[PDB]
Structure 1
């Protein structure tokens, strides 16, 4: 991570995912290892592959500096490690409740999967999704 554009290369990758975003959630990674690394990245590989956003650069002046673009409800995400998850294909896909299955599967501390947007409220696990 060298200069300003080095920070901006991540932010353009950021807003590209927000410009077509949908349901999303969050899980911390302070108790996770490389074993659970391939549990949700293979889940990303279960969708298609690599482009599932899991970039961890959520500083109050970095990723929050990129929130005024869209999804303004994400202002005070600030601290408590944030790891995102996108759903470009499939409006209201499985990626939301994937952490419900994951919290009971080698992930113990997952920041209480507080989520981000679409219920237009605070965290509440929706199981009645359009399948």
Structure 2
């Protein structure tokens, strides 16, 4: 009986950390070990990221009652959840940051605005620029569209005149 106020503290949190999060990552890990307890948890504090272990029996009532676009099947069994609440350009990277600092094969699913993004589709989203990178990518995108296409075309017609 997890709905009892003494046990309800983790029951009420799923509404914020799984549905209410800006980014989330879900993994089948039964416990975190000293290495991730010491470094990966502490590295997340500077990234706007946090993470926790969650029980299956809770999730059978919580992710089935909460509306989710395909994401709730990844909350069956044990769960390590990792998540972020702010700065989209840093928050969306959590799937790659997990795959770099931890065993990438333990991830069940990854999510943005609390909804599932497949591991084959999240690649660009988990590579997204931060605010100071995005204004440089905008200047670069304006350059690529205006001059880049034409200098790439000049180099291509040059290379086509080397060939025989």
TM-score range normalised by the length of the shorter chain: 0.3 to 0.5
The superposition leaves residues 76-125 of structure 1 with CA deviations (integer Å, 9 ceiling, x where unpaired) of 75678766666577674432321120246897999999996257986657
Does 1 or 2 have the higher relative contact order (CA < 8 Å, sep 6+)? 1
CA pair 121-47 structure 1, distance change in 2 beyond 3 A: same
CA contact 1:27–1:81 (8 Å) conserved in 2 = yes
- Alignment CA distance shift 1:113-1:34 (3 Å): farther
The separation in 1 between residues aligned to 2:6 and 2:67, in whole angstroms, is 16
Distance (whole Å) between structure 2 residues aligned to residue 100 and residue 15 of structure 1: 23
Specify whether residues 105 and 51 from structure 1 end up closer, same or farther in structure 2 by C-alpha distance, changes over 3 A only: closer
Bigger share in strand:
2
Uncovered stretches (5+) of structure 2, i.e. residues with no partner = 130-163
Paired with 1:72 and 1:116, the residues of 2 have a C-alpha distance of 6
Evaluate the alpha carbon distance shift between residue 29 and residue 61 of structure 1 in structure 2; reply closer, same or farther with a 3 A threshold: closer
The question of whether the paired residues in 2 share the 8 Å contact of 1:114 and 1:122 is answered with no
Rg larger for: 2
Q: Which moved more, 1:111-120 or 1:85-94?
A: 111-120
Alpha-carbon RMSD across the aligned residues, in angstroms, is: 7.0
Per-residue deviation, 1:14: 2.6
Runs (5+) with no aligned partner, structure 1: none
Per the normalisation by structure 2, the TM-score is 0.40
Count the aligned residue pairs.
Answer: 130
Q: Deviation digits for residues 16-66 of structure 1, max 9, x if unmatched?
A: 425873454445455755223415652465337896555444655233244
Counterpart CA distance in 1 for 2:118 and 2:68 is 20
1:19/1:5 CA distance change after superposition, 3 Å: same
Measured at CA, do residues 66 and 125 of structure 1 come closer, stay the same or move farther in structure 2, by a change above 3 Å?
farther
Larger mean CA deviation between 106-115 and 5-14 belongs to: 106-115
- Equivalent residues of 2:27, 2:106 under 8 A apart: no
TM-score, normalised via structure 1 length = 0.45
